[PDB]
Amino acid sequence: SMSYDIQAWKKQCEELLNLIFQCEDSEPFRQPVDLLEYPDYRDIIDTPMDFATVRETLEAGNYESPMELCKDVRLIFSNSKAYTPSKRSRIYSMSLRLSAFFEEHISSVLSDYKSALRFHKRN
Ligand SMILES: CC(C)Cc1nc(C#N)c(N)o1
Description:
The chain has 5 helices and no strands. By secondary structure, the chain is mainly alpha-helical. It has one domain (about 1-123): Histone Acetyltransferase, Chain A (Up-down Bundle), CATH 1.20.920.10. It binds 5-azanyl-2-(2-methylpropyl)-1,3-oxazole-4-carbonitrile. 5-azanyl-2-(2-methylpropyl)-1,3-oxazole-4-carbonitrile binds near residues 84 and 89. It is classed as signaling protein. The entry lists the keywords bromodomain, phip, crystallographic fragment screen, transcription, Structural Genomics, Structural Genomics Consortium, SGC, signaling protein.
């Protein structure tokens, strides 16, 4: 049961998203971009993504693994680099800080999940 629990990642990701929502650096990324108030957003960005959407996808049970959740979170940050590419921008700096924060904390979630998969496959 608890060692190598292949479902433990879900609550760990719920907790990491709570930390992200607390971060002042997440303010621009908490909700979808208003496509009326930024009419050129979709001219640039193919697939919008934001932390409320990630949080709801997880709650609905629509991620099969923490790697699928990580892919959507990384899309938030690649979308930000595409839409706000200037390294002079304070929004660029916020995006980089929050991405480093997410990458640090998701690392062990992924590592542990993959170790658990390997153990159950072996046995
Ligand atoms: C976060 C975007 C949806 C909109 C947006 N406002 C700014 C500013 N200021 C920027 N770099 O990008």
